[PDB]
Write a protein of this length. Structure first.
Ligand SMILES: C=CC(=O)Nc1ccc(-c2c(C#Cc3cnc4c(c3)ncn4C)c3c(N)ncnc3n2C)cc1
Length: 276
C-alpha cells in the first residue's frame, strides 16, 4: 500500500503539519504527476497564522512502489537543486505518519501559452515585457543547467507565471512526446543534453514571441525530422527583431557545439534588455 507501511521515511526539517495543509482543485493534467492546489497555513517561517496557496503532489489511484519510490527520489532532487527565482522550488513536505505530499510553489497565473494567448493585441504585452520573460527563463535555465538537470518538456505549457509575474520553469523533474520542441540529434539519438536544451529554449522563444503559437504549424510529424535534417527552420515571428530571430536560429544550429551557451544567451538577453 501507499501510506508508508514497510518503506523507510526519514525525518526531515522540511516536513510540514498535515493539519494546516488543505487540498483543493487539481491543476492541469499529469505529465509530472497528480498536482493539486492546496492551502497551507504558516509556511514562510516569517508569516505564521498567515495562510498561503500552494501546490502538492499526491499519488495516483493505480500507484505502485515505483510510483512512490520515484516521488521521494524527486523530492530529494528538488532539495539538492537549491532555490532560484525562475524555477518552482520545494516549499515543504508531509512525509511521516500518513500519505506522502510534496508542497511546491503555486502560480496564480496559468501556463505561459494561455497567459500569452490572453495578453495579445487586456494587459497588452509590450515587446518590452516579452524580453523580460525570455531573460528570466534563460537565467533559470542557466541555474538548472549548473546542477546538471535536464528539462523533460521545455514548453510554455510546462512553464508558469506567478501573481508577481515572475516566470517559473517547471519540468526539471507520462504523456505524448513533444517532438516539435526536440532537436534533430535528440529526435534521432533519443538522448538529451544541454545543447538539445538550447534548441528547446530556441523553440520556447519562438513560442513566446508568437504569443502562444503552434510550432511547425501544419508539417506532419512523420516528415518533420527530414525537414530539420535538410535545414527547415521556423520563419521569423511578427514584431520580433532580427537579432532575436537570429539567436533562435543560433539555438537551432545543426551541430550541437556551435549552438549558444546558456550564459551566452543570458548575457545577450540582458544587453538587449538594457536597450529597451
Ligand atoms: C502535461 C499537461 C499539463 O497540464 N501539464 C502541467 C504542468 C504544470 C502544472 C502545474 C504545476 C506544477 C508542477 C510541478 C511538478 N513537479 C515539479 C515542478 C513543477 N518542478 C519540478 N518538479 C519535480 C503548478 C504549480 N506548482 N503551482 C501552480 N499551478 C501549477 N500547475 C498548473 C500542471 C499541469
Amino acid at each position: 500500500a501507499g501510506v508508508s507501511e514497510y518503506e523507510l521515511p526519514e525525518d526531515p526539517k522540511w516536513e510540514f503539519p498535515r493539519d494546516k495543509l488543505t487540498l483543493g482543485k487539481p491543476l492541469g493534467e499529469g505529465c509530472f504527476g497528480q498536482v493539486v492546489m492546496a492551502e497551507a497555513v504558516g509556511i514562510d517561517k516569517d508569516k505564521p497564522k498567515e495562510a498561503v496557496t500552494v501546490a502538492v503532489k499526491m499519488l495516483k489511484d493505480d500507484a505502485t512502489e515505483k510510483d512512490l519510490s520515484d516521488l521521494v527520489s524527486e523530492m530529494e532532487m528538488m532539495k539538492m537543486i537549491g532555490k532560484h527565482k525562475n524555477i518552482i522550488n520545494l516549499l515543504g513536505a508531509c512525509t511521516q505518519d500518513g500519505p506522502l505530499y510534496v508542497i511546491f510553489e503555486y502560480a496564480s497565473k496559468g501556463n505561459l501559452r494561455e497567459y500569452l494567448r490572453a495578453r495579445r493585441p487586456e494587459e497588452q504585452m509590450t515587446f518590452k515585457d516579452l524580453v523580460s520573460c525570455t531573460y528570466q527563463l534563460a537565467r533559470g535555465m542557466e541555474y538548472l543547467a549548473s546542477q546538471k538537470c535536464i528539462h523533460r518538456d521545455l514548453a510554455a505549457r510546462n512553464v508558469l507565471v506567478t501573481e508577481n509575474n515572475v516566470m517559473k520553469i517547471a519540468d526539471f523533474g507520462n504523456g505524448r512526446l513533444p517532438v516539435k520542441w526536440m532537436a534533430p540529434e535528440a529526435l534521432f539519438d533519443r538522448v538529451y543534453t544541454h545543447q538539445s536544451d538550447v534548441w528547446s529554449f530556441g523553440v520556447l522563444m519562438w513560442e513566446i514571441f508568437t504569443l502562444g503559437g503552434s510550432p511547425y504549424p501544419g508539417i506532419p510529424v512523420e516528415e518533420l525530422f527530414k525537414l530539420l535534417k535538410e535545414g527547415h527552420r521556423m520563419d521569423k515571428p511578427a514584431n520580433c527583431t532580427n537579432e532575436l530571430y537570429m539567436m533562435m536560429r543560433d539555438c537551432w544550429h545543426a551541430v550541437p557545439s556551435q549552438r549558444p551557451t546558456f550564459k551566452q544567451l543570458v548575457e545577450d538577453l540582458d544587453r538587449i534588455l538594457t536597450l529597451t
